[PDB]
RNA sequence: GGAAACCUGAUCAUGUAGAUCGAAUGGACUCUAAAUCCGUUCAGCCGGGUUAGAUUCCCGGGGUUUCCGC
């Protein structure tokens, strides 16, 4: 709740992104106000460790439209970002 | 010094999962090419409020533009 980023992520250990897609997070690291993530299905992005920001929005939903297909996320984990 | 408008890839929009463009990446296709297409990814300048819920509304900071100032 209008946390940082990093935050969020590091708390789920997950990721939304602007489709409604989950990914599992594989890696992250932080460095200024950067933030350097690596997906479990491979994609690497480079993202504003902002608390306003699209993706801390997304994060904080209750929502979501699929989950990413080569991050295999498990049931486990998606239940575990549903009840935050 | 003060006032108003806007906000960081671009333009526009916006209290109930923003959109279009652009870029990165994989694939299809192709001649291991071009063109074309598809999948995946990328946002709210910062800090507080209000709210069930905030990029959106309020206050403050910062930046830009314009206007009024000894
Ligand atoms: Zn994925």
């Known amino acids: 709740n209008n946390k940082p980023l990093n935050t969020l992520i590091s708390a789920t250990g997950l ?11 594989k890696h992250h690291e932080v460095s200024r106000s950067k933030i350097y993530i690596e997906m479990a ?31 295999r996320v498990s049931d486990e984990d998606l239940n575990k970002f549903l009840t935050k």
């Open 15 to 25: 990721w939304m992104s602007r489709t409604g897609t989950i990914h599992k997070i």
């Open 41 to 71: 299905c491979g994609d690497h992005l480079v993202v504003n460790n902002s608390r306003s920001s699209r993706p801390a929005r997304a994060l904080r939903y209750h929502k979501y439209r699929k989950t990413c297909k080569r991050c």
